[PDB]
């Protein structure tokens, strides 16, 4: 029970998805104006990530693994299409299950809840799970840790961009340019955990 807490702490801090692997930057730098919208999108990404990683681990360890169906046949070229299919189907049925109720969370995200399918955090999490060869419980804890780390990074950037209402930025750097430089300074600050052996 110390091992899974080690995995959670590592996947939140030492191997942050947004600011140590740099995945998801389009929504990370576009939806970062208000902290409440950032909070909602972080919770949505958490749910979709912790659902998508264990199901893809089941599909991989049952079918796509070398010598899993018939000995002598390995089907590890359908990895990408399988992963993106499961992620797209989970996002669609989850947005229907959501959109039944929840005008709180519906139309707060709005256009970007269809756009968390084409979002490199989920595909990177699945591909890194496949690479590192996790079991099912380690897959669940890794997915939840990656989701909470991404939510932490995007809510931090939202808080910084809400503190920056006072600042005076040159006209060429209003918006996207100063957002790029702000994310760069954040990534510079997150290198404190760069050498930890966890």
């Amino acid at each position: 029970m110390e091992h899974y807490i080690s995995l959670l702490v590592k996947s939140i801090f030492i191997e942050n998805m947004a600011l140590s692997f740099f995945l998801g930057m389009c929504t990370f730098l576009a939806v970062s104006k208000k902290v409440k919208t950032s909070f909602g999108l972080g919770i949505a990404v958490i749910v979709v990530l912790t659902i998508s990683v264990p199901v893809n681990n089941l599909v991989y360890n049952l079918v796509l693994k070398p010598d899993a169906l018939v000995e002598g046949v390995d089907l590890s070229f359908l990895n990408f299409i399988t992963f993106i299919g499961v992620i797209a189907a989970l996002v669609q049925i989850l947005e229907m299950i959501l959109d039944r109720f929840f005008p709180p969370l519906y139309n707060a995200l709005g256009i970007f809840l269809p756009l968390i399918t084409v979002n490199c955090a989920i595909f990177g999490g699945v591909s890194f799970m496949v690479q590192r060869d996790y079991s099912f419980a380690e897959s669940v804890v890794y997915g939840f840790g990656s989701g909470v780390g991404w939510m932490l990074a995007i809510v931090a950037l939202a808080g910084i961009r809400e503190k920056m209402k006072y600042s005076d930025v040159p006209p060429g750097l209003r918006g996207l340019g100063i957002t790029f430089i702000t994310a760069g300074l954040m990534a510079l600050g997150f290198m404190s955990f760069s050498g930890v052996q966890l």
Binding site: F77, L78, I81, G195
Partner: protein, 251 residues
């Protein structure tokens, strides 16, 4: 719209894409295997001193000069088995092919050790001229893998190379420097009492001593790793007994 229409179009699209993907995936595995083999054959031929340029030259030199075997680590004897298909990194993960290292012997922080190991014998016609041992340990940022080219007396070193490292390139990534690799030639591995005697000195080596090479400048935490790899792998859990057999003349 129509459920028949959507199911028909998705079946047809899946058939076409699956045909193309499966053809392009099966029809290239031979070339992918050839490339993955050549990427390591180049490093082995380079550490053996035999110069190589071009795929034909690489495969022709490796099939006529290098001859891989399998060695058991504990007993120090030869074990019959397929050489060109063995994967020591993956066999060192399963419990039926690897052992659990306890903390008192695990000086190098690798946490496992495979039951059978692979070496490479540089052939000179009929005679065995060198034996190449792959050693590795933990540095600061990564698991540093390497080769070492030991001559037939089991004591002398003829070359060293580092083919996998993730250190910072200015400080501790100087294990890939030719001026640093060029010091290892001529150094002894053991002493007269047949004990491991490779030292990484801090602040420069003595002028021509046969046991200590120069440490990385400003990079002690990787120099501790480069010391620990040889401190463990020249020990008793590594190539110790096989090196005793080579020293007695098991080649």
């Amino acid at each position: 719209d129509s459920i028949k229409k959507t199911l028909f179009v998705v079946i047809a699209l899946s058939l076409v894409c699956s045909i193309i993907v499966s053809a392009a995936a099966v029809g290239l595995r031979d070339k992918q295997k050839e490339n993955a083999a050549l990427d390591k054959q180049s490093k082995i031929l380079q550490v053996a001193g035999i110069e190589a340029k071009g795929s034909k030259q690489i495969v022709e030199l490796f099939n006529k000069s290098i001859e891989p075997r399998l060695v058991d680590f504990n007993t120090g004897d030869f074990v019959e088995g397929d050489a060109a298909n063995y994967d020591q990194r993956k066999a060192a993960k399963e419990a039926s092919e690897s052992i659990k290292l306890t903390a008192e012997q695990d000086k190098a922080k690798i946490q496992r050790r495979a039951n059978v190991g692979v070496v490479y014998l540089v052939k000179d016609g009929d005679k065995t001229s060198k034996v190449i041992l792959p050693v590795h340990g933990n540095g600061l940022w990564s698991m540093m893998y390497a080769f070492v080219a030991v001559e037939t007396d089991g004591n002398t070193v003829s070359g060293l190379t580092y083919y996998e490292q993730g250190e910072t390139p200015g400080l501790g990534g100087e294990v890939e420097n030719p001026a640093w690799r060029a010091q290892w030639v001529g150094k002894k591995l053991f002493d007269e009492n047949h004990k491991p005697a490779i030292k990484i000195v801090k602040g420069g080596a003595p002028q021509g001593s046969e046991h200590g090479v120069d440490g990385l400048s400003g990079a002690t935490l990787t120099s501790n790793g480069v010391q620990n790899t040889f401190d463990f792998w020249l020990g008793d859990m590594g190539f110790g007994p096989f090196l005793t057999k080579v020293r007695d003349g098991g080649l």
